[PDB]
Design a protein around this motif. Sequence first.
Motif, short mmCIF file in Angstrom:
data_model
loop_
_atom_site.label_atom_id
_atom_site.label_comp_id
_atom_site.label_asym_id
_atom_site.label_seq_id
_atom_site.Cartn_x
_atom_site.Cartn_y
_atom_site.Cartn_z
N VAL A 164 0.84 -1.21 0.00
CA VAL A 164 0.00 0.00 0.00
C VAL A 164 0.88 1.27 0.00
O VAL A 164 1.82 1.39 0.80
CB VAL A 164 -1.02 0.05 1.21
CG1 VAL A 164 -1.19 -1.31 1.83
CG2 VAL A 164 -0.60 1.09 2.22
N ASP A 165 0.56 2.22 -0.89
CA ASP A 165 1.34 3.46 -1.03
C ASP A 165 1.89 3.96 0.30
O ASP A 165 1.24 3.84 1.34
CB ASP A 165 0.52 4.57 -1.72
CG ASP A 165 -0.71 4.96 -0.95
OD1 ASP A 165 -1.53 4.07 -0.67
OD2 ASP A 165 -0.87 6.17 -0.64
N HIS A 166 3.09 4.51 0.25
CA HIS A 166 3.72 4.99 1.47
C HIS A 166 2.95 6.14 2.11
O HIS A 166 2.85 6.23 3.34
CB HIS A 166 5.18 5.41 1.19
CG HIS A 166 6.10 4.25 0.94
ND1 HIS A 166 7.38 4.21 1.44
CD2 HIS A 166 5.94 3.12 0.22
CE1 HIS A 166 7.97 3.10 1.03
NE2 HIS A 166 7.12 2.42 0.29
N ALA A 167 2.37 7.00 1.27
CA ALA A 167 1.61 8.16 1.72
C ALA A 167 0.48 7.73 2.61
O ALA A 167 0.20 8.36 3.64
CB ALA A 167 1.06 8.91 0.54
N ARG B 1 2.15 6.97 5.81
CA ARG B 1 2.64 8.18 6.49
C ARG B 1 1.50 8.89 7.20
O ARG B 1 1.63 9.30 8.35
CB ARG B 1 3.27 9.19 5.51
CG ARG B 1 4.71 8.92 5.12
CD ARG B 1 5.44 10.18 4.66
NE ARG B 1 6.70 9.81 4.00
CZ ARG B 1 6.80 9.40 2.74
NH1 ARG B 1 5.71 9.32 1.99
NH2 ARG B 1 7.99 9.04 2.24
N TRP C 138 10.04 1.51 5.32
CA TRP C 138 8.93 1.87 6.16
C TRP C 138 9.38 2.14 7.57
O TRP C 138 8.60 2.54 8.44
CB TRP C 138 7.92 0.75 6.12
CG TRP C 138 7.38 0.57 4.75
CD1 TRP C 138 6.37 1.26 4.18
CD2 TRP C 138 7.81 -0.39 3.77
NE1 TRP C 138 6.13 0.80 2.91
CE2 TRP C 138 7.00 -0.22 2.64
CE3 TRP C 138 8.80 -1.38 3.74
CZ2 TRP C 138 7.14 -1.00 1.49
CZ3 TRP C 138 8.94 -2.16 2.59
CH2 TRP C 138 8.11 -1.96 1.48
N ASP D 284 8.73 7.59 10.26
CA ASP D 284 7.50 8.25 9.85
C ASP D 284 6.41 7.29 9.38
O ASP D 284 5.35 7.74 8.97
CB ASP D 284 7.81 9.23 8.73
CG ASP D 284 8.27 8.52 7.48
OD1 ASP D 284 8.76 7.37 7.61
OD2 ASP D 284 8.16 9.10 6.38
#
Lengths: 585, 585
Positions: A330-333, A336, A362, A366
Amino acid sequence: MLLEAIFHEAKGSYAYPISETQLRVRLRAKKGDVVRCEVLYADRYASPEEELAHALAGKAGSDERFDYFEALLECSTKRVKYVFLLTGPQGEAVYFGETGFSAERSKAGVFQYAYIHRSEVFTTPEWAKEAVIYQIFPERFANGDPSNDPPGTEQWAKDARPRHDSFYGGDLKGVIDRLPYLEELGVTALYFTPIFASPSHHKYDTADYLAIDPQFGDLPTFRRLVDEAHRRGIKIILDAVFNHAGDQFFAFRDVLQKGEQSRYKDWFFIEDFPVSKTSRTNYETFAVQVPAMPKLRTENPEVKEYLFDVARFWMEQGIDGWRLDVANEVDHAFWREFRRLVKSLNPDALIVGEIWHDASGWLMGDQFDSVMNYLFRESVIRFFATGEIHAERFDAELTRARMLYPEQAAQGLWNLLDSHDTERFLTSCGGNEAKFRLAVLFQMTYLGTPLIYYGDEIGMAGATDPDCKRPMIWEEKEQNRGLFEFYKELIRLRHRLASLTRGNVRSWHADKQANLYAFVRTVQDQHVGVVLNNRGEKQTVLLQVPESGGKTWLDCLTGEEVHGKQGQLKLTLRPYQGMILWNGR
Amino acid sequence: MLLEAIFHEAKGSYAYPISETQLRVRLRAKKGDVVRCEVLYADRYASPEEELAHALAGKAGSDERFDYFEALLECSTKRVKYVFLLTGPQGEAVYFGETGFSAERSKAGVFQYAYIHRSEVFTTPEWAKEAVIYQIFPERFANGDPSNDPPGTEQWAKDARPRHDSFYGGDLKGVIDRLPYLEELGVTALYFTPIFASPSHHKYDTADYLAIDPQFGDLPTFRRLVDEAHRRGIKIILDAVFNHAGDQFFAFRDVLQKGEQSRYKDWFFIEDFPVSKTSRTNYETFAVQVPAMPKLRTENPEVKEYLFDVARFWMEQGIDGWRLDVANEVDHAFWREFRRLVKSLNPDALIVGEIWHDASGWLMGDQFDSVMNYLFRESVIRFFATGEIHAERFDAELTRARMLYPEQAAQGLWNLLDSHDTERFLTSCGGNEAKFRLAVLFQMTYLGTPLIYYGDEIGMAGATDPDCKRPMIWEEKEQNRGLFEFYKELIRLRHRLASLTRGNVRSWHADKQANLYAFVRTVQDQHVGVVLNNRGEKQTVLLQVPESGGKTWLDCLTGEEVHGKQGQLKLTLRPYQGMILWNGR
Ligand SMILES: [Ca+2]
Ligand SMILES: [Ca+2]
């Protein structure tokens, strides 16, 4: 020397703050190829004429091919430039900088750490630091409420041998009714595999993220567990599967109906329309062609906001953290922001992703707090169970991983011996308790959060999935109480000795022949040496012991007082015996 | 081979998607150690009994000590697990994977790239992919409105020798009047230095991030410049400082006038009181002892919002990009969020920071589009200007820096020759136009965005600050139109040859003797062999050219038509002559 082997980067796992005013720098280099590594640093805006501040980087440990040097830059300006000074065997010197290597300090250059903002300091739940997680496979832990058992539930017996479609009735209620047991043992947290509403037996294809699956319980019962758990000093951890959903999820069920007319078509990954087919699918799913699992488009704000709401809900229910299922997908954003959201609601809510490869991305501070330590397990398996690798390799494997991520992570990593996705460790040990035990003594004293798989404490057994999912043994006459006691004590020692939870690690001894390994846990003035004779014969060994660290320890397990005689300490270990020596400070 | 020299990671500038289904991968080794590098890969969830795809990584280049290989992986499933196959001079076959190195594929584990999210594909504005910026220090470019001329202004003469605090009255209205000049030149965007209301000669201590400085212009005047430039193909890139504020900032005032009673005390980094004094700081500022520049606490959600509000406004005025000073001294979360904002107002807004050291942590794709290629200047300022380094070195310094970041970043890097902070390049060449030309030629054919300092396009020489800010030469008579037309023709070419803007880079020839360096820009099937003869003599070198890439080239600078024979190309270059050979495709 060999300069194309020396490595460092003013970021990641090689350069990071531990405090707003303290930077941790690490350097990698070929084993033995270096002998003295010093760090010359000063505030970035300081005059080039001024004298730089020195810093000594001790050899933090070495692996199969590399040596690792670690220092600690004391920075007041919160900003700092630094260059290395590497002295080799013959005594030759060289400067290592951003620019490159050179005998002169100038042409060497200088690495730089932009700035240390407190918000970018890797910080995790204090309790998490010193805790013991206990994985609960609900279906087979304890059946406390029969009324919610699914049709065709096989009787709950010790000699039962589970099948992919078997059912035993395990549910939340039961978990509560057993808390006293879980407490007695000393676990401070419970890890629950997926327990959300789902039609399958695995429950990995979520149907309702806002409801506890029926066979397991309901909001009322969950709240109760949480509280009954909380008051007994046990935290709850829920498995979140945000990657993919179930082919029954309200949002996906509409797509299957209104097609391109539903305001939910871009919540998943679809191509050739219409949406349906037998064993074929025009939508992306978990793994390869899994219809019951439509990948969730966690990039779309809507798809994000929902999952996040789901988080909020359960956050309010009172849980203590999340176990991300298939997170790296799943996208890092998303991640975050997830953290931020989770942390505002509860600064102590732990977040643990599940990646089966270098999780460094990861683990900068953050995103997640930690990940399952598959590496720790593998090393463990091959050293105590199968005997594929000797103590030397075991040391290297263990050491290489430690350096993989920042300490903050290193220290939180969930160390499991097994899982519902693997055979029981006892079974891995071919039925040999001795090995099993030693392995536990190690997991229980090593760097990283201890994770006990339900059953292993009372010696359950079992082959790979689903044989590892047999129903929990509850009859005392059918339990390994001696083991249970072994665990209890290890678990206790981990609380009495601070070194074991908040201390670093450094290899103490390794012998590929004797096959005996030893490490030390150090925190402040304390000290705890762990000796493990991984053999089936009686052995004796001499371990280096300078007076600077004390000359008398105590085997926290037997009470025997060992004394050291001039840097040496003679020790006689019994087969697969493990010693936990405490200096006293 | 020296395995401790090989390095790679499934992230950063070594593993990144160039698209949603393509993963670029980079491998580093000791120069010479590796001869062949192939990549074996398949879907992450693929079966072991299944076949593995192949990708031949070609030596993407090579610097002073390392070899760099590159291979593009085609991943439809968007999930890739790969393993390298290295081969050294003696044909020894060793595989490289996440586990380590082994002559057995399986035993070498395998690298993995979680998932390829389209929102995580470093994306930069199309127009910026082939632009040519023009740095404008508004004070000494054009004075079109004398009504703002500060008392004490000087005469605009060719001999004006500026002082650390001189004045010339240059303002925006001048930039407008003189636009027909830029357009003619061929520029595509202008980069201004701080032009926000400030009480100083550099205006680096912003006073009101909401209005032009009185001496430069006003909102109306600004807009006019925007619309006028726009209808000429020129974009506007403002330079804003978000790390710190001026000492007269509406908020800091409140603080220096209401100790801790200030509703803005957490907007700065203050340790104690009294708030201030001359030669004393009770608060943190840019660098050391600089009261005028009070660091802003970008971590504060309010301080952040404001800055964003500043952004929004100027972005509504119609700007297209930002140049950020001391961008590294401000938290990542800020930039990540700032990028997201900006990109939502204008998908084609360029965001360029200023970092005088490895800027990888800012060029991953979620923050800045690029940075100032200071590495470029230094390598150029020594090869053509002083001659401190030879071609070999040059080649290396380039090939190196290049590999610092991902291909999308390296490509937008602003390649300046000089700036408001340094001395003009001609002056670094000792007034030698010959060298300068070649530089310009290289700077105009090499990878990265060409940045032209005001004046340098007509010869304008000058020593370091504040002699680099001499009043723009406007009298055509006292101008080097010869250079002007040289620059222009160069710009035109770079706009005609795709390769020069959207092509990769690979060294063609580098000879330490003759000191002749030749590189090649490429895109699809096009080629632009650029050859640089850096020697006061008329040397003749041979170039390796397999009949695969072409057999006939054309020097766009002269029009001569050279031909290759049996995979060999003979070219005769003159003293400091640049050749730009197009393969005619
Ligand atoms: Ca039940
Ligand atoms: Ca004026």
